[PDB]
Scaffold this motif. Structure first.
Motif, PDB file in Angstrom:
ATOM      1  N   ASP A  24     -18.242   3.574   4.415  1.00 38.85           N
ATOM      2  CA  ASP A  24     -17.609   2.607   3.529  1.00 38.85           C
ATOM      3  C   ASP A  24     -17.450   3.217   2.146  1.00 38.85           C
ATOM      4  OD1 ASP A  24     -16.520   0.391   2.369  1.00 38.85           O
ATOM      5  OD2 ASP A  24     -18.248  -0.918   2.685  1.00 38.85           O
ATOM      6  N   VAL A  25     -16.628   4.267   2.051  1.00 41.26           N
ATOM      7  CA  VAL A  25     -16.457   5.018   0.811  1.00 41.26           C
ATOM      8  C   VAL A  25     -15.940   4.170  -0.346  1.00 41.26           C
ATOM      9  CG1 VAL A  25     -16.137   7.188   2.020  1.00 41.26           C
ATOM     10  CG2 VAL A  25     -14.143   5.789   1.528  1.00 41.26           C
ATOM     11  N   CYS A  26     -15.446   2.963  -0.082  1.00 43.95           N
ATOM     12  CA  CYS A  26     -14.991   2.048  -1.115  1.00 43.95           C
ATOM     13  C   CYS A  26     -16.083   1.117  -1.624  1.00 43.95           C
ATOM     14  CB  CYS A  26     -13.822   1.222  -0.582  1.00 43.95           C
ATOM     15  SG  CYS A  26     -12.354   2.205  -0.218  1.00 43.95           S
ATOM     16  N   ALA A  27     -17.299   1.214  -1.096  1.00 42.18           N
ATOM     17  CA  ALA A  27     -18.405   0.404  -1.573  1.00 42.18           C
ATOM     18  C   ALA A  27     -18.866   0.881  -2.949  1.00 42.18           C
ATOM     19  CB  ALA A  27     -19.561   0.455  -0.582  1.00 42.18           C
ATOM     20  N   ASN A  28     -19.694   0.053  -3.591  1.00 36.16           N
ATOM     21  CA  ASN A  28     -20.208   0.385  -4.913  1.00 36.16           C
ATOM     22  C   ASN A  28     -21.347   1.391  -4.846  1.00 36.16           C
ATOM     23  OD1 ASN A  28     -19.524  -2.958  -5.369  1.00 36.16           O
ATOM     24  ND2 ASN A  28     -18.598  -1.433  -6.729  1.00 36.16           N
ATOM     25  N   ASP A  29     -22.142   1.356  -3.781  1.00 37.26           N
ATOM     26  CA  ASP A  29     -23.206   2.329  -3.575  1.00 37.26           C
ATOM     27  C   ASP A  29     -22.710   3.642  -2.985  1.00 37.26           C
ATOM     28  OD1 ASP A  29     -22.563   1.451  -1.045  1.00 37.26           O
ATOM     29  OD2 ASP A  29     -24.610   0.993  -0.430  1.00 37.26           O
ATOM     30  N   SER A  30     -21.399   3.832  -2.886  1.00 36.92           N
ATOM     31  CA  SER A  30     -20.849   5.003  -2.228  1.00 36.92           C
ATOM     32  C   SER A  30     -21.061   6.258  -3.060  1.00 36.92           C
ATOM     33  CB  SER A  30     -19.363   4.801  -1.968  1.00 36.92           C
ATOM     34  OG  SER A  30     -18.785   5.951  -1.395  1.00 36.92           O
ATOM     35  N   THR A  31     -21.374   7.352  -2.372  1.00 37.18           N
ATOM     36  CA  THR A  31     -21.432   8.676  -2.965  1.00 37.18           C
ATOM     37  C   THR A  31     -20.122   9.439  -2.820  1.00 37.18           C
ATOM     38  OG1 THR A  31     -22.364   9.617  -0.933  1.00 37.18           O
ATOM     39  CG2 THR A  31     -23.903   8.815  -2.593  1.00 37.18           C
ATOM     40  N   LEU A  32     -19.109   8.837  -2.183  1.00 35.25           N
ATOM     41  CA  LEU A  32     -17.761   9.391  -2.110  1.00 35.25           C
ATOM     42  C   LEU A  32     -16.756   8.381  -2.655  1.00 35.25           C
ATOM     43  CD1 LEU A  32     -17.873  10.948   1.465  1.00 35.25           C
ATOM     44  CD2 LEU A  32     -18.037  12.209  -0.669  1.00 35.25           C
ATOM     45  N   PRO A  33     -16.859   8.001  -3.932  1.00 33.75           N
ATOM     46  CA  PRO A  33     -15.969   6.961  -4.465  1.00 33.75           C
ATOM     47  C   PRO A  33     -14.526   7.401  -4.625  1.00 33.75           C
ATOM     48  CG  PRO A  33     -17.280   7.874  -6.211  1.00 33.75           C
ATOM     49  CD  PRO A  33     -17.795   8.486  -4.959  1.00 33.75           C
ATOM     50  N   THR A  34     -14.258   8.702  -4.667  1.00 28.88           N
ATOM     51  CA  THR A  34     -12.906   9.220  -4.802  1.00 28.88           C
ATOM     52  C   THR A  34     -12.168   9.292  -3.475  1.00 28.88           C
ATOM     53  OG1 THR A  34     -13.666  11.502  -4.568  1.00 28.88           O
ATOM     54  CG2 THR A  34     -13.607  10.583  -6.781  1.00 28.88           C
ATOM     55  N   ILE A  35     -12.889   9.183  -2.358  1.00 29.52           N
ATOM     56  CA  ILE A  35     -12.295   9.183  -1.030  1.00 29.52           C
ATOM     57  C   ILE A  35     -11.759   7.813  -0.648  1.00 29.52           C
ATOM     58  CG2 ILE A  35     -12.901   9.709   1.388  1.00 29.52           C
ATOM     59  CD1 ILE A  35     -12.733  12.174  -0.530  1.00 29.52           C
TER      60      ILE A  35
END
Ligand SMILES: CCCCCCCC/C=C/CCCCCCCC(=O)O[C@@H](COC(=O)CCCCCCCCCCCCCCC)COP(=O)([O-])OCC[N+](C)(C)C
Ligand SMILES: CCCCCCCC/C=C/CCCCCCCC(=O)O[C@@H](COC(=O)CCCCCCCCCCCCCCC)COP(=O)([O-])OCC[N+](C)(C)C
Ligand SMILES: CCCCCCCC/C=C/CCCCCCCC(=O)O[C@@H](COC(=O)CCCCCCCCCCCCCCC)COP(=O)([O-])OCC[N+](C)(C)C
Ligand SMILES: CCCCCCCC/C=C/CCCCCCCC(=O)O[C@@H](COC(=O)CCCCCCCCCCCCCCC)COP(=O)([O-])OCC[N+](C)(C)C
Ligand SMILES: CCCCCCCC/C=C\CCCCCCCC(=O)O[C@@H](COC(=O)CCCCCCCCCCCCCCC)COP(=O)([O-])OCC[N+](C)(C)C
Ligand SMILES: CCCCCCCC/C=C\CCCCCCCC(=O)O[C@@H](COC(=O)CCCCCCCCCCCCCCC)COP(=O)([O-])OCC[N+](C)(C)C
Ligand SMILES: C[C@@H]1CC[C@@]2(OC1)O[C@H]1C[C@H]3[C@@H]4CC=C5C[C@@H](OCCC(CO)CO)CC[C@]5(C)[C@H]4CC[C@]3(C)[C@H]1[C@@H]2C
Ligand SMILES: C[C@@H]1CC[C@@]2(OC1)O[C@H]1C[C@H]3[C@@H]4CC=C5C[C@@H](OCCC(CO)CO)CC[C@]5(C)[C@H]4CC[C@]3(C)[C@H]1[C@@H]2C
Ligand SMILES: [Ca+2]
Lengths: 92, 92
Positions: B48-59
């Motif tokens: 879930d790269v669109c989550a707030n806890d994501s470590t891949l926010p640019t994906i």
């Protein structure tokens, strides 16, 4: 195994996020983390959100001390009973 | 188990990295993370790269909401069916 999942995700999301308006994100968050727990992701620093090592320090509030007890029961049921019942199923 | 791996790594790498020119890094990235998933590494904060806890926010982009559904099917097949079929193989 899908029912033990919802027996855990709905009390957890309710105890940890009390101030939520109706949203489609409530259908993900009752099912998302409890499913990834079946595969060894414990979310160690989200358990006990009031701890000092917590990565969810803003979720600390009334009643959140219940959730680590809930998850201890959850994984015992899923991993120690239900996954091994399914091993036992396949073997026999 | 190697085919279920590629059935997952190629849709994932394609949905999450759409803008890739041909590179030898495309032969690693279709096989790397899906293999380490077999051994309990869920990559929890890359789901879930669109989550707030994501470590891949640019994906985060179009179609990336598909990948957590894909990985839920993937591990169910690999861990709940194929690893335990292999336990059942060895026992018998
Ligand atoms: C035979 C097999 C058939 C399947 C049977 C099972 C049924 C499976 C059904 C599951 C219900 C899921 C419903 C989704 C809820 C709405 C999602 C949404 O609005 O946006 C999300 C969708 O984008 C994503 O990336 C998340 C997609 C969900 C991943 C599911 C994986 C867990 C598997 C579970 C398997 C266990 C099931 C247990 C039993 C129920 C993104 O985030 P959000 O916050 O929600 O919204 C956007 C807001 N934001 C941009 C700020 C982030
Ligand atoms: C084996 C080892 C155990 C030894 C035995 C003796 C047991 C010892 C227990 C003793 C009980 C007293 C503990 C609390 C201490 C005082 C209050 C306090 O600090 O509360 C804390 C939480 O905790 C609670 O709010 C209550 C926790 C009670 C759970 C007790 C389980 C019972 C035993 C087992 C049950 C199993 C099932 C039973 C059936 C078999 C407050 O801290 P916080 O949560 O971080 O939140 C604070 C921040 N906030 C203000 C923003 C919220
Ligand atoms: C009997 C057993 C025989 C084996 C059978 C199985 C076949 C095994 C074959 C697998 C395919 C491997 C193809 C490699 C692609 C080229 C990589 C390269 O050039 O550089 C990479 C090599 O360094 C690494 O770190 C990656 C090496 C792969 C490790 C395999 C781990 C997954 C297990 C696999 C097992 C599951 C297989 C499932 C079925 C397919 C490094 O990074 P890059 O980005 O690629 O390039 C450098 C650029 N950079 C500096 C910017 C980083
Ligand atoms: C058990 C619990 C479930 C309860 C039942 C009800 C289901 C509830 C579902 C309801 C559908 C509505 C959810 C989306 C909300 C509106 C749009 C939205 O926010 O989209 C979000 C993603 O999500 C999508 O784009 C669509 C997700 C659809 C899949 C839902 C699963 C279907 C049922 C189960 C399927 C299993 C198989 C079915 C066969 C058995 C956008 O958010 P994001 O992803 O973070 O990206 C935004 C950022 N960006 C703009 C940069 C991209
Ligand atoms: C296993 C058998 C039973 C044995 C258990 C014995 C009983 C357990 C022991 C003690 C009972 C609970 C009290 C101890 C902790 C209180 C401290 C506290 O304030 O905590 C929190 C609130 O917490 C509450 O307000 C809790 C209210 C009761 C919860 C429901 C009972 C749960 C028992 C479940 C049993 C399941 C049994 C299932 C049966 C199979 C934190 O509050 P705060 O943030 O500090 O307050 C300020 C908030 N403000 C800033 C917003 C204003
Ligand atoms: C399981 C049984 C069937 C039930 C399926 C339920 C269907 C699901 C429901 C609805 C269909 C999916 C769309 C809903 C969400 C749209 C919201 C959205 O914009 O999302 C994203 C785009 O995403 C897309 O544009 C996706 C378009 C369709 C994808 C292909 C179908 C997927 C269903 C597969 C079914 C597999 C079935 C397998 C059969 C075993 C985000 O877009 P954005 O970033 O906000 O846009 C701006 C981008 N810009 C800034 C770059 C311009
Ligand atoms: C037997 C089983 C018991 C558990 C369960 O299955 C059956 O019961 C189901 C009922 C579902 C909810 C129904 C209504 C809504 C309202 C909606 O509101 C959109 C608001 C806005 C978006 O911002 C629109 O624009 C959000 C979703 C929500 C809360 C559902 C969540 C999932 C729930 C809890 C399901 C859960 C898995
Ligand atoms: C039946 C199975 C279906 C899946 C599969 O196995 C068989 O099919 C194989 C075909 C492979 C690709 C072939 C061509 C290239 C071009 C190359 O371009 C170098 C460019 C530049 C470097 O920067 C040179 O200087 C990069 C690698 C890539 C994309 C392969 C990736 C792995 C793939 C997808 C394999 C995959 C495991
Ligand atoms: Ca593990």
């Amino acid at each position: 195994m899908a029912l033990v999942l919802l027996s855990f995700g709905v009390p957890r999301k309710a105890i940890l996020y009390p101030h939520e308006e109706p949203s489609w994100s409530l259908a993900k968050d009752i099912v998302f983390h409890p499913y990834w727990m079946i595969f060894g992701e414990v979310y160690a620093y989200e358990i006990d959100v009031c701890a000092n090592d917590s990565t969810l320090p803003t979720i600390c509030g009334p009643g959140t001390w219940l959730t680590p007890f809930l998850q201890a029961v959850y994984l015992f049921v899923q991993y120690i009973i239900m996954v091994n019942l399914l091993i036992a199923f396949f073997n026999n």
